[PDB]
RNA sequence: UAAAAU
RNA sequence: AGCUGCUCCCUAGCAUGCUACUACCG
RNA sequence: GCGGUAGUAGCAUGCUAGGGAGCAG
């Protein structure tokens, strides 16, 4: 169950990086630290907190058309 | 503007060490051999902490070519070697050949003389110049997820909660302040001054460990360069790789260059690069790319000995020995030599490349160069030593976009790194033994041969002043009998007599702690060191592999197995097309299953399931590759012997000795 | 000597087939990364099943996004957009804001006028007047 | 420059260490500052002194390389900038 | 080298090479296209020829697959296979192929000549894929036909830019307009290098033609001007994206209290935003165009982009935008071509302006929130695909009237095109119904709206703005001085010569004629700045001067008469050959010596 | 090779200054009409009278005069300095000049529009 | 034979 | 973007080696 | 009937050269 969230955080940081988010050093530092801290977690309840904090970065900007990719 | 403090060194010597009767040459250019070089550089290491740190480095000077003035380094001032002046420096030239263009574009003189001044408050390392108008912040990306393999592994019971094998090797990402924040770890290199009357004995024993090889210079038509598509350093990487500079120079330009660096000093510039690889800890890893003008020369100086080290079997340094076809078993069977109450032990050097002093690096260079007793003259060997010191031990690192100076310690990406590390490892082990035997109460040593050996060891260190070869051979035989070693570049395994070590007649692990504390400026915790009392289970770890005594056919055999998490992590995380869509990549999994075969013989059970998982995945990959190539065109291939890759007999033959 | 000239043609055929295939795939794979990565991401997210993430994802569908990283401290700020009233009802009951499966105490509402709105002014009737996409600010419980 | 000839002609031999040439002859300095507390003690104001000379500030940027005016570099506004700032100054006589 | 079939969208690698646009076809579809058409060339990963040196057989239906190559039956190897066999052709992905039975319409499009009305009539009743296929192949056919025109060289030098040329005898000479350009090459012995592009203009007398050079290369006697052709880029996005409805307003936030002058448009402004795309059809000179900027400020924060196919249209609506919006407004029209130039406002290079105005062929690839394409009666499916390809936005709005003017479509020479088939969105507006309706005149005199609504529309127009000054003296027109196929008649100009100064206050009228060259005759002996009836259509002025020609099928077109009379404020005149249009005409009759 | 023009291509003219050089200006626009041509200035006639005259005719463009022998370059600075403002640019020698050469400025920058030198 | 393209 | 060491896989060329069968002589 | 060279086809080894991939310090 924690391996699930670790691989998901890998995919999330890769998407964020593809969206040119490392053009702003503050944001990229925040996301990088959240990612490396998720990968080193050792109890699945902190990982989900930092995952919601990390996904908020993608939900912020409007570059990914969310209503389309949510066709379920 | 003062860069030659030669009288102040002599005045300091006469003030503090006045009755020390040996001649002290402030500039080691006037030394008599290599032991004199060590003796005088030991004092220079101390006295150089008084003078200003802006007076060390290249010594530029204005020359004229075709009526145009250049600024180029004639020779460098060193903290350990003093002042050194080039011998062929010619003012007023008409035109530059290829070789001279190479040696004037590799110097840091005109790059640093013509750039903006720099004050970098991020580091404590002395920063020289900024070669351009804006600093560069390099990042590191996260790995790619191979979802098919992960799903497949999950569908067969892997990664369930509370299991033995779980994922701990990932691709960690890093932000902008990662190159410089890691370069700043050179603040761990202090100016250590070694005990010289003991180093001058340890160096003789260490050299005796290297007596069954042969070395010397070779001509430019005998060097071997594997992979000529590697970067060429700075500034040469603006114009091509190493292939371009190995094709543009004839076999006479390279020989002119080599024979030139025996009389002159060429300082170079090292780049620092951020690695992109799997790991278990989030500390960024970086490597030093050295200039082509330095590798091209160190190759002809050192390669004959380096190659004769990697082709010997049964020695102490086990570089070049392979672990397949019964190599692991042979290495362990030869370390266990004959030792009489054997325990095994192994240790760890904390920050081995940043914290290594400079005296031991110079000692490693001298021990490697002791093989040129015929090819080179004496001033030649000194100028080659000065070149190695000016190019890999204090050098102008080019980090980010700006030049800094490097205080000391090994640069990881130079020509002779993995062998200098081995010399330094043996040096520390021999020092530990000397300290452990001299520091014991000679009144209670009952074995009246070891007591007399102690007496003569003291007398040979601190009284007799010329080398005594019979006792050197005697102590070396004692060491090879009671303390057997197996060394790779800083990775050692020692099989030692335990009865002696208990009575303090050979090193223990505390002795390494003390030696590292006072000779290496680090604290080695008892937690990264391991020991082992039961020899039917070999080294707890050596080269990141554990050892297992299995039954292979009729007899018993040592086999190396890895860490299951490592193999799975390499299966699941990659670089975009690699593995992701492995149907184009079936050799990746063949190799990873070659590495994960011994896990089959393991008493645990998930361990073996790793290997079986890899075999079934290869089968599935092939089954769904033929299915696609059949509908793409309409006819299956006519022959593909790829059915051998999912039966165990192809892999077992890689750990059985014939081949 | 005529069976050994189709044994070689039959081999050039294979080493052209097995090369053109991977040259086609190995190039289609690299021409679709920005759109396969996202579908993979959301597949894995939906499979994860965590209400803390489903909440913000659903919310985010109906134009209720946040304006900064969701903080974790028991006291930093969160500024989220609210585009319509039927959104405002389901989340802001009085002065508590229910986002990311938590409870945040609402302190300052401010419409697109960039000027403050009183919380008691927001209701069904008087809604048609406010420049609507608002920005609610709050602090975690 | 005639400054380079000026320092070379004072050498009692003709050769001088390299590490001092950009120190005494360069015409542009670039400071890289990690945090505000360090900016306070080093380049504070619009003219400061380093390497025994008097440098004058012009053009300040940040990690993203976008301009910054010295009015934004206050202490309460410090947590809103890309923190390694790169102050480029010239040599003023 | 792989794609998708044009009919069933399956994987394939075959292209019917004999077709001009080289479309991908699957196995079955390529077999069907080649078994019933003169097209029998195919190209897969490599062309399908007989690979024997000296053989040139190319008919696929008789070729044979040999060893690592395809061979003629005469040059067959001892071991081989036939390519076309069992109702299919051999390509990649053979056994996973889906065969659509649209081969009838596909062959129709592939072998047609675009000369009769049936070709366009079937071009706009097929699936979307075939729609785009027919569009690009039709444009290709037209612009390659343009190559069959004649060539011109020098004859003698007369000045620095008015000279005498020689058209090659026996082949059609191209029309003389500033958008038909020829590149000039000198061929001395030796020396055949480009000297520049040229656009010409027949000046005051023959055979002289004033010209405009791209660079001051001093013209000599040995050069020539050959027309330079153009290429066609294939399309991707469909003509119109599929519709979606909503239950609440999405992406757009309205207002309550700005400029209720757009009063009756509010409920419609909402219905625009609660859909995915909608259309507004409007009789000439009503709330259209007005509606555009009205919705624009109703949604102030909304990014909006405006577009039309005709330059004068986008310019006139940019003017009407300037009349009402913050500036804060740019018209990214054209950097430096379309030599009949345009606006004077801002920028062509920024694309952050909230209001961008341009013409379809020069659109940048931007994001938006609303795209207001204008006058869909003049655009073709090609252009609609161009806009849907370059831009993406949230909503789309199309405004026009199919009863006005269509696209010229030069090559069609028999039959008539009903507006239903002008393009896709005109079809949509007339098949089910403009999903948005607004119809009563604001602009031109009440009486002339009565005239026009009496004829093209069944009568359904009302307005204000009454008299005065309207006249149609049925004026004999003399010599049809026809140099180019565009008519010229200056005895007809003898009426502005009959009314040069006797109009002492009618000084800023606008002159428009159906023919471009007789309008350059208005630019020959000058009365006022003149325009064409095509550079009108979305443009309005106070008083209008108009001249016709003989009763050719050209000028007799009721739609051009509509768009010529309906563009005034309160005065017009019609000088018509007139057999029954002055029996259509609802004004006061005049004569030539009738000046009072 | 030769290529003429229907206009003086970008020749930013003087209005009416130096019409005493009119016997030259009548043909100075010829410079803008063709690519190039030649001129025969017999001894004592219009040598570098034509050249400096056209220099005056176009005071908003960099123009060059060149020679082969340095007696010619001195006679080239001759007949020049008066009709030139100074505002002078005639740089010939960096480290040559077996006899003395130019007299006023530099060799490292090339300032004002009219510059003199030798071909070699 | 009507518009008109880095 | 480093210096080494080991291992698997694919392709090419050459000579050597090996073997079969065909042509010339001894 | 056999010795010698010259051939083709087939086979194994070894060595050079080229490319791809995996692990270790
Ligand atoms: Zn000495
Ligand atoms: Zn040597
Ligand atoms: Zn066809
Ligand atoms: Zn098909
Ligand atoms: Zn044939």
Author numbering:
A (entry chain C): 2 to 73
B (entry chain A): 271 to 929
C (entry chain D): 51 to 191
D (entry chain B): 100 to 192
E (entry chain E): 1 to 596
F (entry chain F): 242 to 361
Which of the paper's sentences describe this entry?
SARS-CoV-2 encodes 16 non-structural proteins (nsp) to assemble a so-called replication and transcription complex (RTC) to facilitate virus replication and transcription. Among them, nsp12 functions as RNA-dependent RNA polymerase (RdRp) by using nsp7 and nsp8 as its auxiliary factors, and nsp13 is identified as a helicase. Two nsp13 molecules bind on the plain region formed by two nsp8 and nsp12. In nsp13-2, the bound 5′ extension of RNA template is in an extended conformation and lies in an RNA-binding channel formed by nsp13 1A, 1B, and 2A domains, with a direction of its 5′ end in 2A domain and its 3′ end in 1A domain.
Cryo-EM grids were prepared, and preliminary screening revealed ideal particle density with good dispersity. Although the overall architectures of two mini RTCs are generally similar, the conformations of nsp13-1 have a distinct shift. In form 1 mini RTC, nsp13-1 employ nsp13-1Q194 and nsp13-1H320 in the 1B domain to contact with the interface domain of nsp12 in region.
